[PDB]
């Protein structure tokens, strides 16, 4: 009994009549390049991607961000081509490349990277970290506005936040310094949310910081809808995600509903969900910038719980499932003596009735 | 004068870590995700989960002279396939439990 294939079988286009005349791979790399391409393609038969690949909605992710900037490709291509011909013209450039002494300025690369591919690389990083999945329930935006957040550590130093880098709670004790490029007249909302900090509800977040109606880059003049609170990741709970979200308002917005007291040290009042908060204000404000960092417990967190939050510090442990053993049998034929220890609860001798 | 070799655990069966999925004289089923290989080509589960059999593109190790020679002589555009057995982990590594309220 044979069943016809449910589609094109692999290696079927290959004409076997003239095998000698066909072009062979001749190299491991060429075969591997084709092999990876074939693996990515969808197949009717069962594949590893089916069982292990994540199942996500086929419909494309909704884009809720600012529109892409308008670029003239013809002029852009013209200038870039002329720039490379100018660079290659220099004899010193060719000699440095040939002698393998040339290098690239990392600072200049990052400046251009922020303007060009940086928003799309930050979106990829945010997608990999689950920020869109948890903040906007799968909706995605491109952070068009580069958001620069740095924590003043000491007097002369600054700890920057670069979309996932680790910042300790000690360094985040005080509100960070936030800068971004904003034209005159614009209004912005800046919030800091802890995706993984909530101690009671799995899907809820903590509103650590919320500044609204920020005129331009003057973050200090923005209304303090929620005072800044340092991140307090519980000891033994792992690494937590702290995400700064910048919103570009279309007009002045009334945030009285989202207002919180000053100071706000009640975890019930700081319970927050970005999706619900944005959903009510989606008409008036668009997600513009995104920064986030990873935080884990440090000694400074204990101060936050005892002093600021006036509570006992919760401690957690990573607990693994108990080891599996088969159901014990009266006669464990061919099993070692230690078989009986696998089902023994106490190591101390027992005496029964005696 | 015969022996028993073959699939101990069929598709969709639940296996525990260390369970022998299959025994074979030669590689008929290849180790997939979370499937270990023994000295005698025995396939065993490295995690607790469901056994799955799939068809995956075969790419040998660059230092496997015998296998690399085969793929280099293949017509361009032709990809080798083999049957792989996988274990889909059923349980998480662990959970975070509250242990103290200092």
């Amino acid at each position: 009994r044979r069943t016809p294939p449910l589609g094109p079988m692999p290696n079927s286009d290959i004409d076997l009549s003239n095998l000698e005349r066909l072009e062979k791979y001749r190299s491991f790399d060429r075969y591997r390049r084709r092999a990876e391409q074939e693996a990515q393609a969808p197949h009717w038969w069962r594949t590893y991607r089916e069982y292990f690949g994540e199942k996500t909605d086929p419909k494309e992710k909704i884009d809720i961000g600012l529109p892409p900037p308008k670029v003239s490709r013809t002029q852009q291509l013209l200038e870039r081509k002329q720039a490379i011909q100018e660079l290659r013209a220099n004899v010193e450039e060719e000699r440095a490349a040939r002698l393998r002494t040339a290098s690239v300025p990392l600072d200049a690369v990052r400046a251009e990277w922020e303007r060009t591919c940086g928003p799309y690389h930050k979106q990829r990083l945010a997608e990999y970290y689950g920020l869109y999945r948890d903040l906007f329930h799968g909706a995605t935006f491109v952070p068009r506005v580069p958001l620069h957040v740095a924590y003043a550590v000491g007097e002369d130093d600054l700890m920057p936040v670069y979309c996932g880098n680790e910042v300790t709670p000690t360094e985040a004790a005080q509100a960070p310094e936030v800068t971004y490029e904003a034209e005159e007249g614009s209004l912005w909302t800046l919030l800091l949310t802890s995706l993984d900090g909530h101690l009671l509800e799995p899907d809820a977040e903590y509103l650590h910081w919320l500044l609204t109606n920020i005129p331009g880059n003057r973050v200090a003049e923005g209304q303090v809808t929620c005072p800044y609170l340092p991140p307090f990741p519980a000891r033994g709970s792992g690494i937590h995600r702290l995400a700064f979200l910048l919103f570009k308002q279309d007009q002045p917005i009334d945030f009285s509903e989202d207002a919180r007291p000053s100071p706000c040290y009640q975890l019930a009042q700081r319970t927050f969900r970005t999706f619900d908060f944005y959903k009510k204000h989606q008409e008036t404000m668009t997600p513009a910038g995104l920064s986030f960092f990873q935080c884990r417990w440090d000694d400074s967190v204990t101060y936050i719980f005892h002093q600021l939050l006036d509570m006992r510090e919760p401690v957690f442990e990573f607990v693994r499932p108990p080891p599996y053993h088969p159901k014990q049998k009266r006669f464990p034929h061919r099993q070692p003596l230690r078989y009986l220890d696998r089902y023994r609860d106490s190591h101390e001798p027992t005496y029964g009735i005696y | 004068s015969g022996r028993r070799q073959g699939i101990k655990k069929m598709e969709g069966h639940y296996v525990h870590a260390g369970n022998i999925i299959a025994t074979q004289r030669h590689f008929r089923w290849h180790p997939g995700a979370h499937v270990g290989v023994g000295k005698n080509k025995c396939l065993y589960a490295l995690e607790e989960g469901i056994v799955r059999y799939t068809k995956e593109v075969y790419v040998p190790h660059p230092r496997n002279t015998e296998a690399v020679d085969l793929i280099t002589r293949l017509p361009k555009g032709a990809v080798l396939y083999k049957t792989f057995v996988h274990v889909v982990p059923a349980k998480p590594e662990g959970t975070f439990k509250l242990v103290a309220m200092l």
Binding site: R1, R2, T3, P4, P5, L6, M9, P10, N11, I14, L16, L19, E20, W44, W45 | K55, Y58, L70, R73, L74, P75, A78, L80, Y81, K82, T83
Partner: peptide
């Protein structure tokens, strides 16, 4: 497996020209 539609998905010797030792 023979009965299944995917029978023969991993046959390769037809692709390679046979060589006699």
């Amino acid at each position: 497996y023979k009965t299944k539609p995917t029978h023969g998905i991993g046959k390769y010797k037809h692709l390679i020209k046979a060589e006699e030792p």
